[PDB]
Design a binder for these strands. Structure first.
Ligand SMILES: [Mg+2]
Ligand SMILES: [Mg+2]
Ligand SMILES: [Mg+2]
Ligand SMILES: [Mg+2]
Ligand SMILES: [Mg+2]
Ligand SMILES: [Mg+2]
Ligand SMILES: [Mg+2]
Ligand SMILES: [Mg+2]
Ligand SMILES: [Mg+2]
Ligand SMILES: [Mg+2]
Ligand SMILES: [Mg+2]
Ligand SMILES: [Mg+2]
Ligand SMILES: [Mg+2]
Ligand SMILES: [Mg+2]
Ligand SMILES: [Mg+2]
Ligand SMILES: [Mg+2]
Ligand SMILES: [Mg+2]
Ligand SMILES: [Mg+2]
Ligand SMILES: [Mg+2]
Ligand SMILES: [Mg+2]
Ligand SMILES: [Mg+2]
Ligand SMILES: [Mg+2]
Ligand SMILES: [Mg+2]
Ligand SMILES: [Mg+2]
Ligand SMILES: [Mg+2]
Ligand SMILES: [Mg+2]
Ligand SMILES: [Mg+2]
Ligand SMILES: [Mg+2]
Ligand SMILES: [Mg+2]
Ligand SMILES: [Mg+2]
Ligand SMILES: [Mg+2]
Ligand SMILES: [Mg+2]
Ligand SMILES: [Mg+2]
Ligand SMILES: [Mg+2]
Ligand SMILES: [Mg+2]
Ligand SMILES: [Mg+2]
Ligand SMILES: [Mg+2]
Ligand SMILES: [Mg+2]
Ligand SMILES: [Mg+2]
Ligand SMILES: [Mg+2]
Ligand SMILES: [Mg+2]
Ligand SMILES: [Mg+2]
Ligand SMILES: [Mg+2]
Ligand SMILES: [Mg+2]
Ligand SMILES: [Mg+2]
Ligand SMILES: [Mg+2]
Ligand SMILES: [Mg+2]
Lengths: 141, 149, 129
RNA sequence: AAGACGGUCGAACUUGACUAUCUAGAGGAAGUAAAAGUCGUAACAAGGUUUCCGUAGGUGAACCUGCGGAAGGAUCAUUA
RNA sequence: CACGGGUGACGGGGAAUCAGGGUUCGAUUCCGGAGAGGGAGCCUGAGAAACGGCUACCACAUCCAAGGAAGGCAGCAGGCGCGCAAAUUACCCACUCCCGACCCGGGGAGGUAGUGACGAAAAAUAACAAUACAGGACUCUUUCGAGGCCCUGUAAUUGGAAUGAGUCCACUUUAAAUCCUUUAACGAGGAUCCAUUGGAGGGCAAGUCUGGUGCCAGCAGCCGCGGUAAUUCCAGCUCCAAUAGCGUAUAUUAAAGUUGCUGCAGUUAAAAAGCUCGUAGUUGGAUCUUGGGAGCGGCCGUCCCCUGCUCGGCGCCGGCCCGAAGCGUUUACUUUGAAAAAAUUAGAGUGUUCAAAGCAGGCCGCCUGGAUACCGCAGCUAGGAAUAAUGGAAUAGGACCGCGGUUCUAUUUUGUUGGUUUUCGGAACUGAGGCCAUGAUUAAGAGGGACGGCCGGGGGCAUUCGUAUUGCGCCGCUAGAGGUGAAAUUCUUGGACCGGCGCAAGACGGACCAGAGCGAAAGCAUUUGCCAAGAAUGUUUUCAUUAAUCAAGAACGAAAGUCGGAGGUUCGAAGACGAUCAGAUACCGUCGUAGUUCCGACCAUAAACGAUGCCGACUGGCGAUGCGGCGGCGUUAUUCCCAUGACCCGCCGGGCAGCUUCCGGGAAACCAAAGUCUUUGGGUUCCGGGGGGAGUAUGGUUGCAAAGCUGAAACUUAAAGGAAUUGA
RNA sequence: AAGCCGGAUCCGUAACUUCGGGAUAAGGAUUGGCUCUAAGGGCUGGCAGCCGACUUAGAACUGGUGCGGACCAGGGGAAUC
């Protein structure tokens, strides 16, 4: 610290209160402006209906067409772009069906070479997408 | 350092270790103080009463020849001033500077000084009021300060 | 200005000790500094010292040995119980074998070991090792 | 006993005001990111007019010019 | 830090993580509060503003013969809806308790079952031997090989022995049951009674194996992999990690000394207000009780002593010693004692088969346990008196000591009932006294002030001088002059430029002028006069803590700019023209408006820089410089010597700086401060938290305006940046 | 064109702005009669007596909710030129 007197407790504590707001991690946690902008509303997972299948080009040093999907969250109505994680899984996904969507690793931050997506599909039609990939289960018909 | 200046000076007086009256000084305590009274009757602050005593009469410090300081001698006799001499000279100086400002107003430097003399008065004024030598209602007014020099 | 006179004595001693000087001069003398310096003698960290006595706050000339590493003051003077005494010596002392905390109690200025034996805490002043 | 003058507590309704959150909007103007796009070359070397700060005016665009500053200068130095 | 606003806010005991500190959580079984769809009002009652009570309105909603009646699951189950997200419309009062008129009744309180990978403890998925094989220590053997006294592992080879998962007689448990425990009988060779989840470039333990694709598919938290020989994709094999578990998304804790009280940083990386003044806030110099005496042990360590004033007892001879009521600057601090619910945490005892647990159990009726520690802060109690505040006697309106009065006045006093007055005590005032050792710490290498001689491009007002520039008048001779890298626009026989003589105006104060001075910063340079101020030095003067830094607030603040007057020589934003050029709305040249100048008001911003807050202390040298003082051989001026000026040699105190250094620090450049820092704490103000978005939007406030101060978010991005090195 | 409002008292009052305004912004409540209560002063010799003159505020009662009862007596707001 700088002030060291035995009767400067109020000065030290009040200075700390002001200076915690310059911490980026603390500012977002203790202001709601970050949570309102969050599509999930603070939840870890969310369910939504599939509106379209969209492919996004990867960043410049890479060259690919990432398989994504446009969904509208049931609890909110907000549009998000979820990423179909594994290889060839996009064929299991058709239009206008219920999927379960979670985060994609970096807590609301873009991750990997994929430009501007935060989310990842984990379940479709109430069956896990990993079971579909391994052949353990089939789509519900 | 100085209260209202960037200088850091060291010039000051050094009292000798011995605090006894010298053997050559024959002026005694009882006949020291009536000389102080008559020099105060001429009209002289205690600062310059002691100045003209230790160069013309050999009395170095009246606190050693007499039992008390000069201002205590005067006030026990009733000749202490209405207000302390150090506060008096700040007020006399502020009057002189303030009078210079009404004659010429572009003197920005002279205006800046006026805060420094006035600030010293208020800092010194509240000290004497805690010591109960000035009344609690004593206030420095720039308009009426001229009358009391 | 000068707010603490013990902080100036310990710092002045440390500067002279760290450079290998034989004598150091503490400009203001107080009962606290004199009492702090005697605690520094019972354990052989300094030699004997003089108190030049003018009619003001006196001076002190200390005979320095090479036996001192760092003397330091703790400001402000916190109030420490005997339960908390163990923690303080765990932060500002090199090892459990040597080094002393000099703290003032109702029984006088004394080190932490001999304060623990008479079961009395107080306010910390400093340390040496 | 039903009932009535009055007093008190007072829900609810209508209107007005005030406040908080969200939301539409012709048009206008930014920011960011995709690009083998058009126009110049402003900054990096004395970057080819040294660079930069405050202010003011002007020009397709970078920018240019006036005044006073700084060296983060391309001089720690220039002689009776 | 009121008032207002927000709370993804019921409070607390507690929970998670943690060295020491802390951060986050606490709807949830205990205590307290509030509520029964939202409000409002009531009856009964000891107790209600009660809702498994009532009365209305509001929202919802049920039955109907259409007249009417009836409702309140945030009780147990169960249904819908909402969602990422949560169990049976089971059994019994057998236990713990509660209620009643009661030993006898009731209790969706509560208990027992069912669903249950929230999570916590224990623990299967093999053990052994023989054969071959491969090694090891043993011996012979230069080796091979040989013997196994001794091992060690491997092998869909062989061989028997031990069991639990499961089926199931029964007993035990229980209200009746189930489960656990017990025990008959079946129950294991590929013991198919067949263990998963993630990975194998690095961080990070483990294949440059093989096949497929070929910047596609895809992998990848990050750096990155993939374009026809992929250690990373899709697969087979092999290997690695934890193990009945493991991966993923999200909130949060440590890591984070990246929120720093312990314990960060601010020259160049992000950063110190342009500067000073200033009240709240923080912090505050020294100074008043020392020591002596007892005992033991070895000069030392431990223990003892250093305020008095109603009643009874070690009691003794009006007195003493002691005990008990109370009295006696106040705190802060520290030790002590009480009181502080359990549960939880720490912890004592105790073989639940061990453990998580529990409060039980042990011995041949008895012996027993069910402790203890912590529980901040605040409040209560008694010791200690260093440290830090605070008080006393200074117009004495002082402390003790007794004397003299006046007033009010308790009750012992007059044999037993009534009246006065004393003494007597208690309270108050007042007069004259005695006496104190009678009563004021020092005077800071803190500060304020006075004084003396100086000193300075410090400030204001007025005056005075200088050459130059431009313009004009006259005179002389002449055809070019200006500018450029080269030219041109430009002036020019109507005489330009050049030379002389004068006049007018407005700017500006060269050379002297320096790593020199002053000023808070901005800034400040001809002479002289006036006015006010100022540092430093000198001081045996004065007061005695009056101080340092400072939210809010206040004064000054270059240039540019804004508003009114005056003046406008030079230069010159805008503008016009001539060049240059691919273009040239520029650099270059000619002209030229606002401005630049003075006066009176605004504005408050600069690379306002030492890119470096202020106060105080300490830690190496050396030579100069400026101001003041002090001392000393000697030259020179006054002249007529003392004394003064100019030089020379030193010392002291502030000042702007310089050189050097293994003081020390730092990432280094470098810094005697940017040192005295993991050996971290002298005091205090401001301010930074990856790069952008952005000093932007919006709200507020100031301004005539331009603009100044305060100041986000969405979103985007693995870097941006500092110092130094080698190349180009 | 006619019509609505109109006085006074008590509340309440926006955008914008040249900070002067806007403003009677806009929008609400009251008003009769009767009987009382309190407050607001001069002269004479903190008290006593004697003189008074008009206003305000409050309260009870009361009428078929009627009361600036006739007369007098602003409709308002959002914008453009
Ligand atoms: Mg990359
Ligand atoms: Mg100050
Ligand atoms: Mg260029
Ligand atoms: Mg350039
Ligand atoms: Mg160029
Ligand atoms: Mg450059
Ligand atoms: Mg230009
Ligand atoms: Mg920079
Ligand atoms: Mg809540
Ligand atoms: Mg709770
Ligand atoms: Mg809740
Ligand atoms: Mg209730
Ligand atoms: Mg409900
Ligand atoms: Mg109720
Ligand atoms: Mg119910
Ligand atoms: Mg109930
Ligand atoms: Mg669940
Ligand atoms: Mg029962
Ligand atoms: Mg029963
Ligand atoms: Mg198995
Ligand atoms: Mg079983
Ligand atoms: Mg790895
Ligand atoms: Mg590895
Ligand atoms: Mg990997
Ligand atoms: Mg593989
Ligand atoms: Mg953390
Ligand atoms: Mg740590
Ligand atoms: Mg940091
Ligand atoms: Mg910087
Ligand atoms: Mg600065
Ligand atoms: Mg002190
Ligand atoms: Mg407890
Ligand atoms: Mg000159
Ligand atoms: Mg300020
Ligand atoms: Mg200016
Ligand atoms: Mg100007
Ligand atoms: Mg003008
Ligand atoms: Mg041109
Ligand atoms: Mg030009
Ligand atoms: Mg010109
Ligand atoms: Mg600035
Ligand atoms: Mg700076
Ligand atoms: Mg530190
Ligand atoms: Mg930042
Ligand atoms: Mg009309
Ligand atoms: Mg209007
Ligand atoms: Mg228009």
């Amino acid at each position: 610290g700088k002030c060291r007197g035995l009767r400067t407790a109020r000065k030290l504590r009040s200075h700390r209160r002001d200076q915690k707001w310059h911490d980026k991690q603390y500012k977002k946690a203790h202001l709601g402006t970050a949570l309102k902008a969050n599509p999930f509303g603070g939840a870890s997972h969310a369910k939504g209906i599939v509106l379209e299948k969209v492919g996004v080009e990867a960043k410049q040093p890479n060259s690919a067409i990432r398989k994504c999907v446009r969904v509208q969250l049931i609890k909110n109505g907000k549009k998000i772009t979820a990423f179909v994680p594994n290889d060839g899984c996009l064929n299991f996904i058709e239009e206008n069906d219920e999927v379960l969507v979670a985060g994609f690793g970096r807590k609301g931050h873009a991750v990997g070479d994929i430009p501007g997506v935060r989310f990842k599909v984990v379940k479709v039609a109430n069956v896990s997408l990993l079971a579909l990939y391994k052949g353990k289960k089939e789509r519900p018909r | 350092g100085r209260m209202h200046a960037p200088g850091k000076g060291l010039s000051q007086s050094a009292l000798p270790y011995r605090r006894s009256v010298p053997t050559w000084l024959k002026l005694t305590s009882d006949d020291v103080k009536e000389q102080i009274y008559k020099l105060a009757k001429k009209g002289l602050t205690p600062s310059q009463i002691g100045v003209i005593l230790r160069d013309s009469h050999g009395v170095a410090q009246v606190r050693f020849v007499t039992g008390n300081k000069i201002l205590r001698i005067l006030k026990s006799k009733g000749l202490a001033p209405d207000l302390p001499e150090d506060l008096y000279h700040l007020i006399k100086k502020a009057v002189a500077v303030r009078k210079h400002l009404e004659r010429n107003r572009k003197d920005k430097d002279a205006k800046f000084r006026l805060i420094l003399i006035e600030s010293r008065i208020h800092r010194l004024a509240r000290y004497y009021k805690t010591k109960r030598v000035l009344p609690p209602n004593w206030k420095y007014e720039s308009s009426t300060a001229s009358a009391l020099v | 200005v000068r707010m603490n006179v013990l902080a100036d004595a310990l710092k002045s001693i440390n500067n002279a000790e760290k450079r290998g000087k034989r004598q150091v001069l503490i400009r203001p003398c107080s009962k606290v500094i004199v009492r702090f310096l005697t605690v520094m003698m019972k354990h052989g960290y300094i030699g004997e010292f003089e108190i030049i006595d003018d009619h003001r706050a006196g001076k002190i000339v200390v005979n320095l040995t090479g036996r001192l590493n760092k003397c330091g003051v703790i400001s402000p003077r916190f109030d420490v119980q005997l339960k908390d005494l163990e923690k303080w010596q765990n932060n500002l002392l090199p090892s459990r074998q040597f080094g002393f905390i000099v703290l003032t109690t109702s029984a006088g200025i004394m080190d932490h070991e001999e304060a623990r034996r008479k079961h009395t805490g107080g306010k910390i002043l400093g340390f040496f090792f």
